[PDB]
Ligand binder design. Sequence first.
Ligand code: MG
Ligand code: MG
Ligand code: MG
Ligand code: MG
Ligand code: MG
Ligand code: MG
Ligand code: MG
Ligand code: MG
Ligand code: MG
Ligand code: MG
Ligand code: MG
Ligand code: MG
Ligand code: MG
Ligand code: MG
Ligand code: MG
Ligand code: MG
Ligand code: MG
Ligand code: MG
Ligand code: MG
Ligand code: MG
Ligand code: MG
Ligand code: MG
Ligand code: MG
Ligand code: MG
Ligand code: MG
Ligand code: MG
Ligand code: MG
Ligand code: MG
Ligand code: MG
Ligand code: MG
Ligand code: MG
Ligand code: MG
Ligand code: MG
Ligand code: MG
Ligand code: MG
Ligand code: MG
Ligand code: MG
Ligand code: MG
Ligand code: MG
Ligand code: MG
Ligand code: MG
Ligand code: MG
Ligand code: MG
Ligand code: MG
Ligand code: MG
Ligand code: MG
Ligand code: MG
Ligand code: MG
Ligand code: MG
Ligand code: MG
Ligand code: MG
Ligand code: MG
Ligand code: MG
Ligand code: MG
Ligand code: MG
Ligand code: MG
Ligand code: MG
Ligand code: MG
Ligand code: MG
Ligand code: MG
Ligand code: MG
Ligand code: MG
Ligand code: MG
Ligand code: MG
Ligand code: MG
Ligand code: MG
Ligand code: MG
Ligand code: MG
Ligand code: MG
Ligand code: MG
Ligand code: MG
Ligand code: MG
Ligand code: MG
Ligand code: MG
Ligand code: MG
Ligand code: MG
Ligand code: MG
Ligand code: MG
Ligand code: MG
Ligand code: MG
Ligand code: MG
Ligand code: MG
Ligand code: MG
Ligand code: MG
Ligand code: MG
Ligand code: MG
Ligand code: MG
Ligand code: MG
Ligand code: MG
Ligand code: MG
Ligand code: MG
Ligand code: MG
Ligand code: MG
Ligand code: MG
Ligand code: MG
Ligand code: MG
Ligand code: MG
Ligand code: MG
Ligand code: MG
Ligand code: MG
Ligand code: MG
Ligand code: MG
Ligand code: MG
Ligand code: MG
Ligand code: MG
Ligand code: MG
Ligand code: MG
Ligand code: MG
Ligand code: MG
Ligand code: MG
Ligand code: MG
Ligand code: MG
Ligand code: MG
Ligand code: MG
Ligand code: MG
Ligand code: MG
Ligand code: MG
Ligand code: MG
Ligand code: MG
Ligand code: MG
Ligand code: MG
Ligand code: MG
Ligand code: MG
Ligand code: MG
Ligand code: MG
Ligand code: MG
Ligand code: MG
Ligand code: MG
Ligand code: MG
Ligand code: MG
Ligand code: MG
Ligand code: MG
Ligand code: MG
Ligand code: MG
Ligand code: MG
Ligand code: MG
Ligand code: MG
Ligand code: MG
Ligand code: MG
Ligand code: MG
Ligand code: MG
Ligand code: MG
Ligand code: MG
Ligand code: MG
Ligand code: MG
Ligand code: MG
Ligand code: MG
Ligand code: MG
Ligand code: MG
Ligand code: MG
Ligand code: MG
Ligand code: MG
Ligand code: MG
Ligand code: MG
Ligand code: MG
Ligand code: MG
Ligand code: MG
Ligand code: MG
Ligand code: MG
Ligand code: MG
Ligand code: MG
Ligand code: MG
Ligand code: MG
Ligand code: MG
Ligand code: MG
Ligand code: MG
Ligand code: MG
Ligand code: MG
Ligand code: MG
Ligand code: MG
Ligand code: MG
Ligand code: MG
Ligand code: MG
Ligand code: MG
Ligand code: MG
Ligand code: MG
Ligand code: MG
Ligand code: MG
Ligand code: MG
Ligand code: MG
Ligand code: MG
Ligand code: MG
Ligand code: MG
Ligand code: MG
Ligand code: MG
Ligand code: MG
Ligand code: MG
Ligand code: MG
Ligand code: MG
Ligand code: MG
Ligand code: MG
Ligand code: MG
Ligand code: MG
Ligand code: MG
Ligand code: MG
Ligand code: MG
Ligand code: MG
Ligand code: MG
Ligand code: MG
Ligand code: MG
Ligand code: MG
Ligand code: MG
Ligand code: MG
Ligand code: MG
Ligand code: MG
Ligand code: MG
Ligand code: MG
Ligand code: MG
Ligand code: MG
Ligand code: MG
Ligand code: MG
Ligand code: MG
Ligand code: MG
Ligand code: MG
Ligand code: MG
Ligand code: MG
Ligand code: MG
Ligand code: MG
Ligand code: MG
Ligand code: MG
Ligand code: MG
Ligand code: MG
Ligand code: MG
Ligand code: MG
Ligand code: MG
Ligand code: MG
Ligand code: MG
Ligand code: MG
Ligand code: MG
Ligand code: MG
Ligand code: MG
Ligand code: MG
Ligand code: MG
Ligand code: MG
Ligand code: MG
Ligand code: MG
Ligand code: MG
Ligand code: MG
Ligand code: MG
Ligand code: MG
Ligand code: MG
Ligand code: MG
Lengths: 185, 275
Amino acid sequence: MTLKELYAETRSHMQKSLEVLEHNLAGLRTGRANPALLLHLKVEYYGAHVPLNQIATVTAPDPRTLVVQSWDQNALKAIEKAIRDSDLGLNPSNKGDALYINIPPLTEERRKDLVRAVRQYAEEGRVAIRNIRREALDKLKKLAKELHLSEDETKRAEAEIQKITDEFIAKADQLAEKKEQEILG
Amino acid sequence: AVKKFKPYTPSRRFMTVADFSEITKTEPEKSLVKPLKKTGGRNNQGRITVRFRGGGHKRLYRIIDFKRWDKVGIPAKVAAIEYDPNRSARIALLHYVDGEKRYIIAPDGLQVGQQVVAGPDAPIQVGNALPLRFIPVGTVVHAVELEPKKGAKLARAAGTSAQIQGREGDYVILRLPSGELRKVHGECYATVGAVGNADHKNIVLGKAGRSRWLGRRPHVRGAAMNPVDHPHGGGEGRAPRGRPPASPWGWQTKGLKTRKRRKPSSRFIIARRKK
RNA sequence: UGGUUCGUGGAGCCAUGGGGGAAUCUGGGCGGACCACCGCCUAAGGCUAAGUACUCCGGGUGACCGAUAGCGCACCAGUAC
RNA sequence: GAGCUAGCCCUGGCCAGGGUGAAGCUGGGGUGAGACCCAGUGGAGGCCCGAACCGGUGGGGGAUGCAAACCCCUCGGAUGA
RNA sequence: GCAGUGAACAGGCUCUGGCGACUGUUUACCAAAAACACAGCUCUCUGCGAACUCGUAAGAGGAGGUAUAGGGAGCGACGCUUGCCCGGUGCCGGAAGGUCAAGGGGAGGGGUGCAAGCCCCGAACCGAAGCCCCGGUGAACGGCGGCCGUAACUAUAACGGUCCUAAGGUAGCGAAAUUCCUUGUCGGGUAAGUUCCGACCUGCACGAAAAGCGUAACGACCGGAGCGCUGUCUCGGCGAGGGACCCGGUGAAAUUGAACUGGCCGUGAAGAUGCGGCCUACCCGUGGCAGGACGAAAAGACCCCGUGGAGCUUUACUGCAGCC
RNA sequence: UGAAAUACCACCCUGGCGCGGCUGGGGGCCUAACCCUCGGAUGGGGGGACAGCGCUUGGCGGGCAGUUUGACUGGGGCGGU
RNA sequence: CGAUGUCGGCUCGUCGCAUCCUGGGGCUGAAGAAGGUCCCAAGGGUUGGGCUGUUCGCCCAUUAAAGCGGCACGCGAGCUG
RNA sequence: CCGAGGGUAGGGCCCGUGACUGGGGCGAAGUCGUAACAAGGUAGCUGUACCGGAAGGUGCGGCUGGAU
RNA sequence: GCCCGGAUAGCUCAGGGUAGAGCAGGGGAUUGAAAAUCCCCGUGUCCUUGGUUCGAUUCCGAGUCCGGGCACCA
RNA sequence: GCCCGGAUAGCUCAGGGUAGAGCAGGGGAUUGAAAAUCCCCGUGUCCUUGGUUCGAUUCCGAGUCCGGGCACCA
RNA sequence: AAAAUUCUAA
Ligand SMILES: [Mg+2]
Ligand SMILES: [Mg+2]
Ligand SMILES: [Mg+2]
Ligand SMILES: [Mg+2]
Ligand SMILES: [Mg+2]
Ligand SMILES: [Mg+2]
Ligand SMILES: [Mg+2]
Ligand SMILES: [Mg+2]
Ligand SMILES: [Mg+2]
Ligand SMILES: [Mg+2]
Ligand SMILES: [Mg+2]
Ligand SMILES: [Mg+2]
Ligand SMILES: [Mg+2]
Ligand SMILES: [Mg+2]
Ligand SMILES: [Mg+2]
Ligand SMILES: [Mg+2]
Ligand SMILES: [Mg+2]
Ligand SMILES: [Mg+2]
Ligand SMILES: [Mg+2]
Ligand SMILES: [Mg+2]
Ligand SMILES: [Mg+2]
Ligand SMILES: [Mg+2]
Ligand SMILES: [Mg+2]
Ligand SMILES: [Mg+2]
Ligand SMILES: [Mg+2]
Ligand SMILES: [Mg+2]
Ligand SMILES: [Mg+2]
Ligand SMILES: [Mg+2]
Ligand SMILES: [Mg+2]
Ligand SMILES: [Mg+2]
Ligand SMILES: [Mg+2]
Ligand SMILES: [Mg+2]
Ligand SMILES: [Mg+2]
Ligand SMILES: [Mg+2]
Ligand SMILES: [Mg+2]
Ligand SMILES: [Mg+2]
Ligand SMILES: [Mg+2]
Ligand SMILES: [Mg+2]
Ligand SMILES: [Mg+2]
Ligand SMILES: [Mg+2]
Ligand SMILES: [Mg+2]
Ligand SMILES: [Mg+2]
Ligand SMILES: [Mg+2]
Ligand SMILES: [Mg+2]
Ligand SMILES: [Mg+2]
Ligand SMILES: [Mg+2]
Ligand SMILES: [Mg+2]
Ligand SMILES: [Mg+2]
Ligand SMILES: [Mg+2]
Ligand SMILES: [Mg+2]
Ligand SMILES: [Mg+2]
Ligand SMILES: [Mg+2]
Ligand SMILES: [Mg+2]
Ligand SMILES: [Mg+2]
Ligand SMILES: [Mg+2]
Ligand SMILES: [Mg+2]
Ligand SMILES: [Mg+2]
Ligand SMILES: [Mg+2]
Ligand SMILES: [Mg+2]
Ligand SMILES: [Mg+2]
Ligand SMILES: [Mg+2]
Ligand SMILES: [Mg+2]
Ligand SMILES: [Mg+2]
Ligand SMILES: [Mg+2]
Ligand SMILES: [Mg+2]
Ligand SMILES: [Mg+2]
Ligand SMILES: [Mg+2]
Ligand SMILES: [Mg+2]
Ligand SMILES: [Mg+2]
Ligand SMILES: [Mg+2]
Ligand SMILES: [Mg+2]
Ligand SMILES: [Mg+2]
Ligand SMILES: [Mg+2]
Ligand SMILES: [Mg+2]
Ligand SMILES: [Mg+2]
Ligand SMILES: [Mg+2]
Ligand SMILES: [Mg+2]
Ligand SMILES: [Mg+2]
Ligand SMILES: [Mg+2]
Ligand SMILES: [Mg+2]
Ligand SMILES: [Mg+2]
Ligand SMILES: [Mg+2]
Ligand SMILES: [Mg+2]
Ligand SMILES: [Mg+2]
Ligand SMILES: [Mg+2]
Ligand SMILES: [Mg+2]
Ligand SMILES: [Mg+2]
Ligand SMILES: [Mg+2]
Ligand SMILES: [Mg+2]
Ligand SMILES: [Mg+2]
Ligand SMILES: [Mg+2]
Ligand SMILES: [Mg+2]
Ligand SMILES: [Mg+2]
Ligand SMILES: [Mg+2]
Ligand SMILES: [Mg+2]
Ligand SMILES: [Mg+2]
Ligand SMILES: [Mg+2]
Ligand SMILES: [Mg+2]
Ligand SMILES: [Mg+2]
Ligand SMILES: [Mg+2]
Ligand SMILES: [Mg+2]
Ligand SMILES: [Mg+2]
Ligand SMILES: [Mg+2]
Ligand SMILES: [Mg+2]
Ligand SMILES: [Mg+2]
Ligand SMILES: [Mg+2]
Ligand SMILES: [Mg+2]
Ligand SMILES: [Mg+2]
Ligand SMILES: [Mg+2]
Ligand SMILES: [Mg+2]
Ligand SMILES: [Mg+2]
Ligand SMILES: [Mg+2]
Ligand SMILES: [Mg+2]
Ligand SMILES: [Mg+2]
Ligand SMILES: [Mg+2]
Ligand SMILES: [Mg+2]
Ligand SMILES: [Mg+2]
Ligand SMILES: [Mg+2]
Ligand SMILES: [Mg+2]
Ligand SMILES: [Mg+2]
Ligand SMILES: [Mg+2]
Ligand SMILES: [Mg+2]
Ligand SMILES: [Mg+2]
Ligand SMILES: [Mg+2]
Ligand SMILES: [Mg+2]
Ligand SMILES: [Mg+2]
Ligand SMILES: [Mg+2]
Ligand SMILES: [Mg+2]
Ligand SMILES: [Mg+2]
Ligand SMILES: [Mg+2]
Ligand SMILES: [Mg+2]
Ligand SMILES: [Mg+2]
Ligand SMILES: [Mg+2]
Ligand SMILES: [Mg+2]
Ligand SMILES: [Mg+2]
Ligand SMILES: [Mg+2]
Ligand SMILES: [Mg+2]
Ligand SMILES: [Mg+2]
Ligand SMILES: [Mg+2]
Ligand SMILES: [Mg+2]
Ligand SMILES: [Mg+2]
Ligand SMILES: [Mg+2]
Ligand SMILES: [Mg+2]
Ligand SMILES: [Mg+2]
Ligand SMILES: [Mg+2]
Ligand SMILES: [Mg+2]
Ligand SMILES: [Mg+2]
Ligand SMILES: [Mg+2]
Ligand SMILES: [Mg+2]
Ligand SMILES: [Mg+2]
Ligand SMILES: [Mg+2]
Ligand SMILES: [Mg+2]
Ligand SMILES: [Mg+2]
Ligand SMILES: [Mg+2]
Ligand SMILES: [Mg+2]
Ligand SMILES: [Mg+2]
Ligand SMILES: [Mg+2]
Ligand SMILES: [Mg+2]
Ligand SMILES: [Mg+2]
Ligand SMILES: [Mg+2]
Ligand SMILES: [Mg+2]
Ligand SMILES: [Mg+2]
Ligand SMILES: [Mg+2]
Ligand SMILES: [Mg+2]
Ligand SMILES: [Mg+2]
Ligand SMILES: [Mg+2]
Ligand SMILES: [Mg+2]
Ligand SMILES: [Mg+2]
Ligand SMILES: [Mg+2]
Ligand SMILES: [Mg+2]
Ligand SMILES: [Mg+2]
Ligand SMILES: [Mg+2]
Ligand SMILES: [Mg+2]
Ligand SMILES: [Mg+2]
Ligand SMILES: [Mg+2]
Ligand SMILES: [Mg+2]
Ligand SMILES: [Mg+2]
Ligand SMILES: [Mg+2]
Ligand SMILES: [Mg+2]
Ligand SMILES: [Mg+2]
Ligand SMILES: [Mg+2]
Ligand SMILES: [Mg+2]
Ligand SMILES: [Mg+2]
Ligand SMILES: [Mg+2]
Ligand SMILES: [Mg+2]
Ligand SMILES: [Mg+2]
Ligand SMILES: [Mg+2]
Ligand SMILES: [Mg+2]
Ligand SMILES: [Mg+2]
Ligand SMILES: [Mg+2]
Ligand SMILES: [Mg+2]
Ligand SMILES: [Mg+2]
Ligand SMILES: [Mg+2]
Ligand SMILES: [Mg+2]
Ligand SMILES: [Mg+2]
Ligand SMILES: [Mg+2]
Ligand SMILES: [Mg+2]
Ligand SMILES: [Mg+2]
Ligand SMILES: [Mg+2]
Ligand SMILES: [Mg+2]
Ligand SMILES: [Mg+2]
Ligand SMILES: [Mg+2]
Ligand SMILES: [Mg+2]
Ligand SMILES: [Mg+2]
Ligand SMILES: [Mg+2]
Ligand SMILES: [Mg+2]
Ligand SMILES: [Mg+2]
Ligand SMILES: [Mg+2]
Ligand SMILES: [Mg+2]
Ligand SMILES: [Mg+2]
Ligand SMILES: [Mg+2]
Ligand SMILES: [Mg+2]
Ligand SMILES: [Mg+2]
Ligand SMILES: [Mg+2]
Ligand SMILES: [Mg+2]
Ligand SMILES: [Mg+2]
Ligand SMILES: [Mg+2]
Ligand SMILES: [Mg+2]
Ligand SMILES: [Mg+2]
Ligand SMILES: [Mg+2]
Ligand SMILES: [Mg+2]
Ligand SMILES: [Mg+2]
Ligand SMILES: [Mg+2]
Ligand SMILES: [Mg+2]
Ligand SMILES: [Mg+2]
Ligand SMILES: [Mg+2]
Ligand SMILES: [Mg+2]
Ligand SMILES: [Mg+2]
Ligand SMILES: [Mg+2]
Ligand SMILES: [Mg+2]
Ligand SMILES: [Mg+2]
Ligand SMILES: [Mg+2]
Ligand SMILES: [Mg+2]
Ligand SMILES: [Mg+2]
Ligand SMILES: [Mg+2]
Ligand SMILES: [Mg+2]
Ligand SMILES: [Mg+2]
Ligand SMILES: [Mg+2]
Ligand SMILES: [Mg+2]
Ligand SMILES: [Mg+2]
Ligand SMILES: [Mg+2]
Ligand SMILES: [Mg+2]
């Protein structure tokens, strides 16, 4: 257990919650130049639904348009009906082993809920972080007690946990800050 | 049926005063009253030995006949029934045709002007008094001598009574109000019937004052003192008792049987009380 | 339980709150648990001078003070306050 | 030492004025009879306003004071624990 | 007539939360409160020469009362309610048993004496309370979990596997008088709101009589907003009187090593009128301001030290009253 | 045929009683000690050899009392020693 | 430690320059305007408000600009508290 | 004098809207168990009260639209 | 940081030369199929080291990591 | 360091002539199952050692461990 | 007078 291995465990534990944030931020119709926003979507490959990250290649050349480079042209028609799926309200062109999707300038009705979406995913990330930190102090409550460790020691172990916790918070604040300016841009 | 009040003051919402409807005489018999010495709970040392007593309305003690075996076979007329500030019960004024007047506790149903009388041969009837042995088993009966010629001591409060559960030797078996089954001597008198003013239990002293009138000072919680003052004292902020909750003097108050164990009266108590 | 030098010690003696409880000299206590031998002493009623202790008082005397000393008070002080 | 202060006991005393208008009573309505409603009367209450009186909220002043806890402005209770 | 309670005496108000029902009570002399008290609800002890309290006792108080009464404890009008855990602790019940003191009992040994004897020691066994043991007991003390994985699609888990517990927090409430991260996130109000109100639930560490959530009314209590009005402010001015100032009279105080007591850059026990170098500076007052004299005042009250002291606690130790 | 012979005696063992002797425990009743009570008292009624009190035993025993509650230490504590 | 009164604010300032505006410059990936960076420069200046005890910082509306620091985190025998 | 209207104050109704929330509907190759229809394997329904992941269980009383 | 335990297969465990149990796993059966049941089958330097005995999971020393109890903060 | 005790099979147990008792286990009857019921049987220096009586788990002596009991601790 | 659950389709 011990300290260094508790910090590495912590910094590790907090990273997973941070990357999870980045996942949640790409997969939104951001500035909509993102490729990974369309990378996860329910399709219909041979009756069964599966994620298209085992079906096609999303690549974002220019920002205003986007291509969903596929390798199965009977799946592109399964994808095309799955892009025309309730949500994005986009009119893609298809075939010629091609599948283009141009992106309109985000309206103030969708721009309204985009920022609102970003900050929401933002706070939940932090609560993921903070809830881990409390897990870490309880790991420290026992670990100090179990090991008969000093008092002024177990004080700094707290502050050293705060230092660590204000790490993953500032990045999390910076992630959702940038992703916003791409929506306001 | 106690009297209630429309809430013109916030104490008056739930205050309740007695219906007072059994009372005829609104002033006491002069030959039968005497002053009640008010202690404030202090002994012949002026050291308090009952806390939170004193400050009540003045009281004139009315001389009560607890030993109706005094005048035997002498009938007497129920002159009046009046308020006694020294008990729960109501009192009855007795015009002994003998020419003497007397005060007794007023059983319920007893009506002004009727006759009553002591005597072994007395009628088993509301107000009459007899040795228990000559009272039939299973009669509701109050004001009972505990030992012969040692005066009424049991069921002297409103609505409280006793019942006979049987006989045995020179004793008879009584259910007290507490629910105890006691053996009392047969030659002890008893007034048949139960004490009146049954509503007394359902009086709502309404405010803080009413308790000051009854001579009852405020009762300061153990928790509110300091360890100097009490066991329950001390403790930053509020605190739970933190020990078997105890008296000021330091004895447990949550189920600590306190009666003397070797008390010779125990041989005559068939059963402990109920509930 | 106290007392004695004796703090429970091998703990006698002297004393005595509780229980038990005799005998009249061939009776009784003691001599450091106890036993015996050898000795000493006569408990359970009382009184008794002197030699001893103190200094309100009175006298005598100081390698005692000399008014911030010497008694708190040399003086109208246990007063004034 | 309870001539301050605390409680209790004994015996007396004090609380301008004004506002509110309970139960009860009577009459009217009402019904089989009531419940009830209403009208007048009445005058209850740890009710209201507010002097004495008892307090002592906020503010300023006072700080070798007028004062070893005071003064001014403001405020709380004011028939009752 | 500017103006009529013509002068004097005589509420600013509304909206919205928190705490406590309320009128009261309190730290005489820094706290008036949310604190105590309060009706009211619950547990419990008490059959009377009551329990309890004061006292060595006598004797009182309880009460010239009597289970609708008296004491002890907690909670705190009222509204709806108050869940599980009795393994420990407490209490209550338990004529079995285990242990257990004095005493009894004297198997059996010892001292001594020629001896009759005198003296001590002493096993099994009988032998109370207490304890153990057996139950009951929460408005008695008290306590009310962890981890693995899980659905057409993710995070999510109604389900479910499993470890521990005496048993794992029901209702209701929740960034709260409690939330560390925290100015959490969203909503309101504002031009802008770490406070405030409305929400969410990630309750560091709410929760059901140390009550839980609400509630009309009440409050010199503690928040937030708005109207009215203003010297609170921009930002200050002027005027009044009592002081302050001058004259006459009377005349204190703390403090005071001595004084012939400048600024700066250094130095010095590390913050110099007083030591070095330099600059500045004629003798003596009065009215004014406070930066310095580590100014005054109080043998620091914080911090430590002392085989100092005191109040308080308890399953520290040893006793003592009390009760058995 | 028995390891141990049966008939009468004798001292003893595993037990069971029958009384006698000394002990110990229960239960019940009694009254006169002792307690309470009865305006009446050298008495009546109630309790009753229990309760109460004295000596002695063991216990429960913050209700109260006397005390203890270590040092080192880059202040003390806490961790360590 | 026989006491050097400790956060913040108000009042009054005064100094430093690692300069926020302002004045003088070199270079510039300096067309111009407007910026970046370094150099010189302490004469003057450096707004009002919401929030919270806050310094800080966030936000509002401005401006040439809303500089950073010292003076016992300047300043309580000056005030607040 | 009255008077359109203006303004101050306090009320009533209606509509739009609101963080958050409470259930309701339509979906379907799910997760979960399997209540009703046979006595559906505990006869069902029912008003109520309490509890329970969920359908439901249970207490009291009722109905036959309950079987032998 | 000292005193009671613990370790023994994949997990959970009970036991002076010996080898078990329950069910995760793989099968077989009862069903028209899947259910929960019914039977088999694997699985162990019996934690490392060291010392007793003819031989030790079994006795003991030393630990290791764990349930901790108490004491520490108090 | 006194006292009171027990060692009887896989676990737990009652018992001068003698060797038992229960569920666990194995077989078997019934069971589509869980069981439950039912018939058959073991698993023994009756702790060591030693001593009595004709011999003895049975009485005693002395030992080893565990269990409880007690008081004490310069 | 009963120990035993569940069922992708034109
Ligand atoms: Mg430190
Ligand atoms: Mg009323
Ligand atoms: Mg009345
Ligand atoms: Mg009456
Ligand atoms: Mg008279
Ligand atoms: Mg007297
Ligand atoms: Mg006196
Ligand atoms: Mg009957
Ligand atoms: Mg009753
Ligand atoms: Mg009631
Ligand atoms: Mg009274
Ligand atoms: Mg009361
Ligand atoms: Mg109280
Ligand atoms: Mg207090
Ligand atoms: Mg005191
Ligand atoms: Mg006192
Ligand atoms: Mg105490
Ligand atoms: Mg105390
Ligand atoms: Mg306490
Ligand atoms: Mg307290
Ligand atoms: Mg607290
Ligand atoms: Mg007795
Ligand atoms: Mg002595
Ligand atoms: Mg002695
Ligand atoms: Mg002696
Ligand atoms: Mg002698
Ligand atoms: Mg002689
Ligand atoms: Mg002799
Ligand atoms: Mg003698
Ligand atoms: Mg002698
Ligand atoms: Mg001698
Ligand atoms: Mg001698
Ligand atoms: Mg002799
Ligand atoms: Mg003699
Ligand atoms: Mg004598
Ligand atoms: Mg003599
Ligand atoms: Mg003499
Ligand atoms: Mg001279
Ligand atoms: Mg003199
Ligand atoms: Mg002189
Ligand atoms: Mg002089
Ligand atoms: Mg007085
Ligand atoms: Mg007085
Ligand atoms: Mg009036
Ligand atoms: Mg009226
Ligand atoms: Mg009428
Ligand atoms: Mg008419
Ligand atoms: Mg009528
Ligand atoms: Mg009033
Ligand atoms: Mg008022
Ligand atoms: Mg007057
Ligand atoms: Mg006065
Ligand atoms: Mg005042
Ligand atoms: Mg004042
Ligand atoms: Mg002042
Ligand atoms: Mg005022
Ligand atoms: Mg006033
Ligand atoms: Mg008033
Ligand atoms: Mg009055
Ligand atoms: Mg009064
Ligand atoms: Mg006018
Ligand atoms: Mg005026
Ligand atoms: Mg007015
Ligand atoms: Mg006025
Ligand atoms: Mg007014
Ligand atoms: Mg609220
Ligand atoms: Mg308010
Ligand atoms: Mg309010
Ligand atoms: Mg609040
Ligand atoms: Mg209040
Ligand atoms: Mg008072
Ligand atoms: Mg005060
Ligand atoms: Mg006062
Ligand atoms: Mg004071
Ligand atoms: Mg005050
Ligand atoms: Mg007040
Ligand atoms: Mg007593
Ligand atoms: Mg005393
Ligand atoms: Mg006493
Ligand atoms: Mg006493
Ligand atoms: Mg008495
Ligand atoms: Mg009296
Ligand atoms: Mg009491
Ligand atoms: Mg009470
Ligand atoms: Mg009571
Ligand atoms: Mg309370
Ligand atoms: Mg109720
Ligand atoms: Mg328990
Ligand atoms: Mg218990
Ligand atoms: Mg129990
Ligand atoms: Mg139970
Ligand atoms: Mg008991
Ligand atoms: Mg013991
Ligand atoms: Mg003995
Ligand atoms: Mg003896
Ligand atoms: Mg003896
Ligand atoms: Mg002998
Ligand atoms: Mg011998
Ligand atoms: Mg000899
Ligand atoms: Mg013995
Ligand atoms: Mg015994
Ligand atoms: Mg016993
Ligand atoms: Mg028990
Ligand atoms: Mg138990
Ligand atoms: Mg509860
Ligand atoms: Mg908790
Ligand atoms: Mg899924
Ligand atoms: Mg999944
Ligand atoms: Mg909790
Ligand atoms: Mg909940
Ligand atoms: Mg919250
Ligand atoms: Mg917030
Ligand atoms: Mg709330
Ligand atoms: Mg913390
Ligand atoms: Mg905010
Ligand atoms: Mg906000
Ligand atoms: Mg909004
Ligand atoms: Mg807004
Ligand atoms: Mg806003
Ligand atoms: Mg906001
Ligand atoms: Mg809130
Ligand atoms: Mg809690
Ligand atoms: Mg509680
Ligand atoms: Mg509670
Ligand atoms: Mg409360
Ligand atoms: Mg609340
Ligand atoms: Mg309500
Ligand atoms: Mg309210
Ligand atoms: Mg008030
Ligand atoms: Mg207030
Ligand atoms: Mg307010
Ligand atoms: Mg001004
Ligand atoms: Mg002026
Ligand atoms: Mg002037
Ligand atoms: Mg002058
Ligand atoms: Mg000079
Ligand atoms: Mg230097
Ligand atoms: Mg210098
Ligand atoms: Mg110089
Ligand atoms: Mg100078
Ligand atoms: Mg010089
Ligand atoms: Mg110089
Ligand atoms: Mg010159
Ligand atoms: Mg001057
Ligand atoms: Mg100054
Ligand atoms: Mg001055
Ligand atoms: Mg000073
Ligand atoms: Mg000092
Ligand atoms: Mg000091
Ligand atoms: Mg000091
Ligand atoms: Mg102080
Ligand atoms: Mg000393
Ligand atoms: Mg000391
Ligand atoms: Mg003192
Ligand atoms: Mg402890
Ligand atoms: Mg006594
Ligand atoms: Mg007692
Ligand atoms: Mg005889
Ligand atoms: Mg006998
Ligand atoms: Mg008898
Ligand atoms: Mg008499
Ligand atoms: Mg008499
Ligand atoms: Mg008798
Ligand atoms: Mg006795
Ligand atoms: Mg005594
Ligand atoms: Mg004793
Ligand atoms: Mg003890
Ligand atoms: Mg003490
Ligand atoms: Mg103790
Ligand atoms: Mg001493
Ligand atoms: Mg020590
Ligand atoms: Mg120690
Ligand atoms: Mg130290
Ligand atoms: Mg050393
Ligand atoms: Mg240190
Ligand atoms: Mg050092
Ligand atoms: Mg240091
Ligand atoms: Mg330490
Ligand atoms: Mg230390
Ligand atoms: Mg200092
Ligand atoms: Mg010094
Ligand atoms: Mg000084
Ligand atoms: Mg300071
Ligand atoms: Mg600060
Ligand atoms: Mg600071
Ligand atoms: Mg310069
Ligand atoms: Mg420069
Ligand atoms: Mg630079
Ligand atoms: Mg620069
Ligand atoms: Mg420039
Ligand atoms: Mg340039
Ligand atoms: Mg170039
Ligand atoms: Mg240019
Ligand atoms: Mg250009
Ligand atoms: Mg640069
Ligand atoms: Mg400048
Ligand atoms: Mg300058
Ligand atoms: Mg400047
Ligand atoms: Mg504002
Ligand atoms: Mg503010
Ligand atoms: Mg603030
Ligand atoms: Mg910063
Ligand atoms: Mg900064
Ligand atoms: Mg600022
Ligand atoms: Mg911020
Ligand atoms: Mg510019
Ligand atoms: Mg510019
Ligand atoms: Mg600009
Ligand atoms: Mg700035
Ligand atoms: Mg500004
Ligand atoms: Mg400056
Ligand atoms: Mg600083
Ligand atoms: Mg500074
Ligand atoms: Mg600093
Ligand atoms: Mg400073
Ligand atoms: Mg500053
Ligand atoms: Mg400062
Ligand atoms: Mg200063
Ligand atoms: Mg100063
Ligand atoms: Mg303050
Ligand atoms: Mg009009
Ligand atoms: Mg108009
Ligand atoms: Mg109009
Ligand atoms: Mg309007
Ligand atoms: Mg309107
Ligand atoms: Mg929304
Ligand atoms: Mg659906
Ligand atoms: Mg059903
Ligand atoms: Mg079914
Ligand atoms: Mg069914
Ligand atoms: Mg039903
Ligand atoms: Mg049920
Ligand atoms: Mg049909
Ligand atoms: Mg394993
Ligand atoms: Mg330590
Ligand atoms: Mg402790
Ligand atoms: Mg030994
Ligand atoms: Mg079986
Ligand atoms: Mg089959
Ligand atoms: Mg020992
Ligand atoms: Mg089925
Ligand atoms: Mg299914």
